[model samples]
Target: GPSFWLGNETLKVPLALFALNRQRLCERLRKNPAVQAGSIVVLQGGEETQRYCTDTGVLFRQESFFHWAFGVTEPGCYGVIDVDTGKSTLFVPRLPASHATWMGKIHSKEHFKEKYAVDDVQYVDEIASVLTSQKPSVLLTLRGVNTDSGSVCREASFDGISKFEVNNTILHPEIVECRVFKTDMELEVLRYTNKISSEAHREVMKAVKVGMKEYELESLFEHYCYSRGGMRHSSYTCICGSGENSAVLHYGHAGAPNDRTIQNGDMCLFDMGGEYYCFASDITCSFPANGKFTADQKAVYEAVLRSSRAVMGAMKPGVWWPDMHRLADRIHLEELAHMGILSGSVDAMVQAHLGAVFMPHGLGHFLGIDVHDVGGYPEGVERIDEPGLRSLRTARHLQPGMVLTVEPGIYFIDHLLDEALADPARASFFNREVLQRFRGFGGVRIEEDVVVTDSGIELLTCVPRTVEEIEACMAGC
Candidate 1:
């Protein structure tokens, strides 16, 4: 009676998940001195809007924070939770009767009350007077900057809100802290997302051929994910990059469109993921276009794979996340030296920040409702002002219940490589003759999702990872 299931073989997410989230949030807020006894939490849900002000109906995805709290699918809604009693009330938009003709049946207040398992439900128009009746000392409206995107969360407002005392400062941090730790129910949803996406990656690897277009692989992945996993949307744009295009970190957007044709020996870096119930899974598989890896490709691929395994092995509670980033960088530097691409002391090369020249992006980011999830940098935490480190989404120490992507890659980006070679101090580390062999060798990225646990990490992403594993998977096609 209180579960959200997509039927068939999909997951059954109990509404109690959101209930637990609210309970945790209330418990945290109650201990804060800034919160008052009669205070109530107010959150404005995502609104319905069309693309370009046209009649084209845009698919609606719930706002992350609102979904985190209420799990309501429909837009134009508000939620209220009493701080003292932990009672929840939902305020849904009142639609005109004719609205049903175009947008399906309009649900009654009781329907929402039962659907969301809330204590009560009311029309959005009555929100102001509804709160007045409860006689709350202050309305704790949500409003704060998301550290990942730097975009401020929407604050709850209404026509009659002017008559009440509203405090926007108290809710954001408290609620964000609660979301940083996942409940057992949330872990099951994340595991399902990763499992479905992993199968999709396997399907794409088998279907890939030497002459196919990059976008074709993207279509194949989406089709498999939707047909079998009930995933209607990907976590982000499908980055299906092949050959030289693979070096472009994000190659599936408008201009690039992932249009390159796969060549005989080109490395394929297909970074794609499927979304289930708003939870996300991001996975990347790098293999050869013709079902076999070249000598150069195998060396670079295994190097990144080593670094990926290193980070996962070192992940545990109380470890600094940035240290993991540096660990990956150091491993890459040592491997590149062995390959004769660079020469000199690894420590000196690291001091010159040589890793950013190859892998410019952060090692990974938090994965949840949004790919780069919130609470990355809380108050008093600042981004390290270095090249690759600055691109990191979070800087906090590791803790249980946190989900993250551990992706390490090696790319032959011309501009960055050229910049490093031009500097006299950094140029001493480069072996120009050996590095020239990989001019158009493209890149290799090995990405996997994992959840932090008491002992170490539980790997959420399962796919062909090693050079031998990837070759065997593709050969079976």
Candidate 2:
């Protein structure tokens, strides 16, 4: 059996995981009437890349689709799964002799064969000849829009491809459906990612100080993840926002750069995750920079914490994810009322869309290979089209094996607050005096990763959650 490891304590992932994934995908395609008996599934892998117009190279991560099927690490490759025989063939680039001088050792076909446990391996130059000799009836290539990014995954292509009848329509949906449900082996890898990422967050909480630049904590988390957990890449850009920056949903982009100075009374929202292999974990922890929550801070933090817990408690198979989002929204509204920041019936507040003013984003989203993942809005599945729900990456019913994040947050963004205050209907709910006191109070978010089960969900993320737990953990630090 083929397994991937990075020495030390890093988890060894068996290549058999992708083997099972390929088998499951074959099972689904065989049932589709559009899939012919002799159909061959073809997928392209990512290529070695460099920074624009420079010799500077970027680290190569395997393409998501190819990784799911073959578990190959090197790029410039293709994977073929024969529908009838259920056998896999991997095609790898034939690097030049100089590759040994520039990059390290050049692996042979046999090396890849043993490394990925594929049935056969061939140099990419021989793809046309090797595939043609197989006498496949049709080639099924992946081509579909990713619901999250709205970008189309290009179909597999090669020289002499026109010689075969290619069906790009059938594979994307089938493969996406397969990825949505994680196998037991895949779950093990995801669990390790969460474990390591949670620990990195804990370390950051301990070392955090009021005077440090936000990126310092970001660097510390990355260092811990790589040095201890063997995580070479993070799931996405680390969102380390402090003070007013905490109100920003996606704060750690190139322009913002997590550069804010953490003030003594400022709220810190660090949303980060570590990726092992290509598996991902997403978690966010919001805490007070002073290691103790003030009164207003405690109110907002507990409000978000309560909503997070409420959503987790109600998660299970067969339930609608949109309803779970609404549950979080209603809780935030009720808590805002209780805090004297709003004065109205919770029912009327929701009707007026007051929740969007506080929590503008969706409750959470499916997390996996890509941070936002895929298969959110399939053919007939549509987005809710409402204010907050419309921002959701997925609106499907919950099912066993679906991995997602339950992140609930309440923010006091200036622009959003100003807009709400100007609207007659929504403005009626606001208690101006109480709301003005929180003008620059930033935000609080509690996020967790979980796997949906038959009974309920198995919570994968394990950082300090409650106010007391967070305070105690910070105090002991």
Candidate 3:
């Protein structure tokens, strides 16, 4: 059955989800004596953006932080939460009377308050005036750098807002820490969303074949996710790479465009996911483009699958995130060595950062509202700046309630292999003879979303991973 992506309203998430998050933040605020006295958390929702040199506006998506707290979908809106009182307020634009002609109903203050379950709602223009009346000792705003992207997410600002001391320390980490741990409701939404993406992966296997353009697989995946529940957004770029293109991580960009025609005995790697409500799903499925695997293809895939599963089984409460990353690297190298691509002690190569030549990306990252969700490296979380390890989004200890992805891949890129070949020391470990056949063999990556549970890990996605299962799926049996 096609369930609605938009819950009852334009938002698919239930009101209880946001209320629970608000209460959690309030409970955390109450513990801090200073916040308990008086403090206000303010965040602005995302604004609409126009297409390049065009008047057509892109779709509006609520900011992650704001939507997490208020579950608001509209742009040009602001939300505030009272630290001591645990009450929430929303400030919306006061549209002109003519707005009804184009934008439809101009919701009243009372309507917004009731709809968002806030204590009060006022026009955006009244924020300064209203906050001045409250006279809070502190105005907490979100201000932090997204470690993965190095993009700084500035806090809500106002000209008159210099009135109170705006501290990033108190609220940024606290809220981000809160976000790392998903609520029961958030988990449910993510689970369902992942299921849809997983099914979409299986459906794409049926559509894949030789001679078809690579982008067609993307079209099929998106169509399935969208038709499922009015869903029309991809968590990130839909990477559809085949043959040598698959080795190029983050493929399907403007230059490449995933436009290559599939060829017989080529590996197809597709990393994509669909959005449910504002939450996101990130799943990667790589299979032989012709429905059956060549021997080399299955071997490489099984190698990465082992690494993926090893981390999944090993993850638990209090485990170090970076440790899992290193473990993945070690396992990845072990498989490569077994396949005669690399030689010498697997441990030695991993220690020297040689495995990074194969898989250059981080193991995985936190998945939520934004695909590379916020709060990856919160305060007190240090990133290990090693080759394969530094790229990791977070290096904190694993804990229950957190949701992240586990993807391990091995790519046969000539540039990297050539570099190894140029250096006698680095080249000595590789089996240069066998590496020739895999020059254009591309790579294999197995990815899935998993939630940290009290006992261990809880996988949110279920798709064919083994060669037999994938063969069965492609065979349509």
Candidate 4:
């Protein structure tokens, strides 16, 4: 049985709030001089592709900036946001007469106009003529990749006339800066998505046990969400890794299908999220496969959990995310010191910021319309110069209504640890003997989605945290 559904009937508000925020974004763009009359912004939509294959030739959904302004979901379509008049137009693929028989009934131009709330809709073939007549400064938010060269479907679409110049503008950074904070609607969808995804995590915990394949647990998670009225889309690929595979930060690929069999005394980590109405939740939970954590596993897991909590508590309005990340690193360093993994004074090592040796990834990232959603840092803010702070997923000051993940983890990567030990200046901080005992202990990560509030923060999920709670849940409690 699933643990609980965190969201009830209150989700409608956030969803509507998200749509209105998107409208505000369009209005902001319209006011920019760079986006002038005869100026156009072209955005492409995602297309379906083969399962488990990264190469689809077609694009994934363009960034939220484009999605927010256009509000179209179909592929082979381009949305034009006219800067001069604040009107929006959608250019849709016009199927041939025979396409009706092969590809089913095609939607009329009016259908698209009504569906996306655009001012007008035209056939894709009319794009060149539209551009020529308007002679607008065309801004294209297209990503360039060296690997895309020589591909069969390299060119998106060709324009014969050079009179209407099109410029490839790297607009994602600007757009991401704009999307950092969540509007009411985005927050609502995110809350619902997190609620359902948290339930899915609880279900996986109950089903997890010794001798189960890692993918089997993943199947159970997907089943619980899809079977219920929960996950209609996936925020990202599921990462389910056991034992040694868990050490890899982003594991679970074709070469690594997370098929390893769980055994007694081994720990497993599952990082996944589900989507609702296009908003996503990213949650990660680590536990023992045999429904009980060994002494060493418990130590590492608790260390990470403590760090996660510390970061969450520190997150509030006017707090810089990078500063909180550094604070979390210090908390983990203290834990490692107490466990005899680090020697000498904890203060010295913390001041030197040596805790980064165990945890190399960012504390968390913004979440909304897209996972790793845009607007991590504003345009004028300078990035932190330190090694650990530099890796922060977001550095902007915390604001109300903003949704983000607070996931702090610890990993015993031999190479990273060995390098730190080899450095004479950093060698005194680590206790070599204690580190050796947990070399094969794998990794531990606990992630939760949190919303910044006026006074503090709100944790969207209430999954098990301590070892006792985790073991009880795994034992079918």
Task: Candidate 4: list runs displaced more than 4 Å.
Answer: 1-22, 30-38, 47-65, 130-161, 165-173, 229-233, 377-385
Candidate 4 accuracy as TM-score: 0.85
Query: Cα lDDT of all candidates, in order?
Result: 0.91, 0.92, 0.84, 0.72
- Give the per-residue lDDT of model 4 (tens digit) for 1-477: 111233543243322342354455556666565654465656655544654666535434443444555545566676666555656677888888778886578889987776666678988788778767666766544443211121221223446435555655444443444566666556656767788788889989998878888889878777766666355457887889888777788687788888788888888889988865566789999998888877788888899989888888888899988878878788888888888888777778877768778778888888877777656654576667776677776678888988889988888888888888888879988777778888878898899999999999988876888899998898887
TM-score, one value per model: 0.98, 0.99, 0.94, 0.85
| Tens digits of per-residue lDDT for model 2, 1-477 | 868999899999999998999899999999999899889999989998999999888999998988888888887999999998899999989989788997799989899898888899998899899999999999999999988777889899999899999999999999999989989999999999999999999999999988999999999999999999999999999999999999988799999999988999999999999999999999999999989999999999999999999999999999899999899999999999999999989999999888888988989988878778878888999998888899988999999999999998999989899998999999999999999999988898899999999999999999998889999888874
lDDT of 4 at 428: 82
The sequence of per-residue lDDT tens digits that candidate 1 reaches over residues 1-477 is: 588887888888999988888888899999999899999999888888887979777888888888898899898999999999999999999999889887799889998899999999999999988999999999999899987667888898888999989999889988887788888999999999899899999989999999999999999999987888888889999999999988999799999998998999899999999888788889999999998887888899999999999999999999899999999999999999999999999999899999988889999888888888778888987899998999999999999999999999999999999999889989999999999999889999999999999999999988988777888888883
Model 2 alpha-carbon drift over 4 Å, by segment: none
TM-score of 3: 0.94
Between candidates 2 and 3, the one scoring higher on lDDT is: 2
Error of 4 at 82 (Å): 2.4
Badly placed stretches (over 4 Å) of model 1 are none
Give the 10-residue window scoring lowest on summed lDDT in candidate 4: 146-155
